Nucleic acid binder design. Structure first.
Ligand SMILES: OC[C@H]1O[C@@](CO)(O[C@H]2O[C@H](CO)[C@@H](O)[C@H](O)[C@H]2O)[C@@H](O)[C@@H]1O
Ligand SMILES: [Mg+2]
Length: 580
DNA sequence: CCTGACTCGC
DNA sequence: GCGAGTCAGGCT
């Protein structure tokens, strides 16, 4: 049943056709400066397998790779593009990426290999990568015979699946989403990951020492207040000290035992002086383990840069995710954690970090899609939306809005931005589910358009089986018909939240594409470094700041045209921390 | 070596 | 509402 192919010892002309399925295999999950273990090409002339050391040293092959007119169909082209960048080789002409195509057709499938994508079209003449390479300690590249056939089978599947995938995307009206948005974005993310972000390791190591000292003190104080020493990091051991030895009350209980979440401890603080210390301990320990030691582990010792990997085909909303390290969750709320950002600096002297973020893009998108007159007017006046929401919900003038009123109005808006449950609102505001319901009801009286939208989107999700975003990204919600209240309610909140969060994702992705085109036209050295959901982080010569101050916000604000303006705030400084 | 509990961002 | 990374504890 084996698949026929040529295991070539040298590159030939028929291997350089202007249309082909290409496989440039990188087995290591983290593909930065990683090995390319084999190459497979499938075209009109047949199927071929080439040894990397052979193909990558061949002028003809390298030129073919870099020729934008020679079209390649691939799976996860960013992986190959970056692996090639580290070797000084440019990959161009990728006209179809099966991973991105499968992701757009149904992000819930979790397609992470050619076999998974192929199964969507009843194509099974290819093995899952895990079956070929195993997983974990047993992971490894098999002998050439097995490797070669696997790569050729993947290339063959890609070659065969391009047409059906493109046809369904077209039917879904997502063909431009793939070709004009996700694929071009893939190349931009590849440049961003490759460039990396410079880290001041000495700065990180210094704060690391401080934390270590502060942890040691708090750690001791904790054993003193408890009368004994224990593993504070053990929610099991901590529970014993807290709810048994010290007799603190049990307010919430986890599926396995005593709940020691920050929300719980906060309520126990007044009962004993140990609680505040445990909280402070959790905090410092979080920064030390995750943002100091964890970050230092992934910095490249030679360039002192971190090279994250943006997973472009994971989230169900269209947002990107970041790993090794995750640069989308660097502290900022609390000052102590915020200082971690002083560790991220420009890659060159006399360069600066420039950060631009969308102001309330989710609520602006909601005003647009729901066409709520009150909400649209609020943004047209560029009002503080939380203060305004408080004025309406509580029926008071702007002067009458107290800090606590604004805080609660902010929580209601937050719940709308992320589509959290009524139960979630009650929990966040530490009030009763019933009182939370009253707030929500009050909100709908003030924003009837939003109310209308929420009801209409749920019905639409039930009728069509999915909801869509501004640029036609899609999310199937089969649980929307479930007779189980909880499961159904969850699907309903996703129906409400996806067009909002998803459309916000579409916009920033287009802004990134538009921005890169503008930077190139202007011949600026500035370049994108990171994207954190609603913000773009760049670095550039200090001499380009003034131009970026006008260029970046404009490009971001004009990415799309909504019924309300889009607003972008920006700052720049010597470190990421200073770009505030 | 995998799940639960925790916490960080938006 | 979720992404990711940490830890501890049980697998084994
Ligand atoms: O190259 C990223 C791309 O690969 C997938 C599998 O096709 O994920 C792999 O690589 C990620 C980054 O190293 C890991 O987080 C993940 O565990 C590994 O399977 C895709 O999900 C992703 O788009
Ligand atoms: Mg913002």
């Amino acid at each position: 049943a084996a698949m026929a192919f040529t295991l070539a010892d040298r590159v030939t002309e028929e291997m350089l056709a202007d249309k082909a399925a290409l496989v440039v295999e990188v087995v290591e999950e983290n593909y930065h400066d990683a090995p390319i273990v084999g190459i497979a090409v499938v075209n009109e002339h047949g199927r071929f397998f080439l040894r990397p050391e052979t193909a990558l040293a061949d002028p003809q092959f390298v030129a073919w790779l870099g020729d934008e007119t020679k079209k390649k169909s691939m799976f996860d082209s960013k992986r190959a593009a970056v692996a090639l960048k580290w070797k000084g080789i440019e990959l161009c002409g990728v006209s179809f990426d099966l991973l991105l195509a499968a992701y757009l057709l149904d992000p819930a499938q979790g397609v992470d290999d050619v076999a998974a994508a192929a199964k969507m079209k009843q194509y099974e003449a290819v093995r899952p990568d895990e079956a070929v390479y195993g997983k974990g300690a047993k992971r490894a590249v098999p002998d050439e015979p097995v490797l070669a056939e696997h790569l050729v089978r993947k290339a063959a599947a890609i070659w065969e699946l391009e047409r059906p995938f493109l046809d369904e995307l077209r039917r879904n009206e997502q063909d431009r989403l793939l070709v004009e948005l996700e694929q071009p974005l893939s190349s931009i993310l590849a440049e961003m990951e490759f460039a990396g972000v410079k880290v001041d390791t000495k700065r990180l190591e210094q704060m690391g020492k401080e934390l270590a000292e502060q942890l040691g003190t708090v750690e001791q104080r904790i054993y003193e207040l408890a009368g004994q020493e224990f593993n504070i990091n053990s929610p099991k051991q901590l529970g014993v000290i807290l709810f048994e030895k010290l007799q603190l009350p049990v307010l919430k209980k986890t599926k396995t035992g005593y709940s020691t979440s920050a929300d719980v401890l906060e309520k126990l603080a007044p009962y004993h002086e140990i609680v505040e210390n445990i909280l402070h301990y959790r905090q410092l320990g979080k920064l030390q383990s995750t943002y100091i030691e964890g970050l230092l582990k992934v910095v490249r010792p030679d360039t002192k840069k971190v090279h994250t990997i943006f997973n472009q085909a994971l989230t169900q909303t269209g947002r990107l995710s970041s790993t090794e390290p995750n640069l989308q969750n660097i502290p900022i709320r609390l000052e102590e954690g915020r200082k971690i950002r002083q560790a991220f600096v420009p890659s060159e002297s006399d360069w600066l970090i420039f950060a631009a973020d969308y102001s309330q893009i989710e609520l602006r998108v909601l005003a647009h899609i729901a066409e709520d007159d009150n909400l649209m007017e609020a943004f047209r006046r560029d009002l503080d939306i939380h203060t305004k929401t408080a004025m309406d919900i509580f029926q008071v003038s702007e002067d009458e809005v107290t800090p606590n009123m604004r805080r609660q109005a902010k929580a209601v808006n937050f719940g709308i931005v992320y589509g959290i449950s009524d139960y979630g609102l009650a929990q966040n505001l530490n009030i009763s589910r019933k009182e939370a319901a009253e707030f929500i009801e009050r909100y709908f009286e003030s924003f009837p358009g939003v109310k209308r939208y929420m009801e209409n989107i749920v019905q639409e999700a039930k009728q069509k089986g999915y909801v869509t975003t501004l640029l036609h990204r899609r999310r199937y919600l089969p649980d929307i018909t479930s007779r189980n209240f909880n499961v159904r309610s969850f699907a309903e909140r996703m129906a409400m939240n996806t067009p909002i969060q998803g459309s916000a994702a579409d916009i920033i992705k287009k802004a990134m594409i538009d921005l890169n085109a503008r930077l190139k036209e202007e011949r600026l050295q500035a370049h994108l470094l990171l994207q954190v959901h609603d913000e773009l982080i760049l670095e550039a010569p200090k001499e380009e700041m003034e131009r970026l101050c006008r260029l970046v916000p404009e490009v971001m604000e004009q990415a799309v045209t909504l019924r309300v303006p889009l607003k972008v705030d920006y700052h720049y400084g010597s470190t990421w921390y200073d770009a505030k």
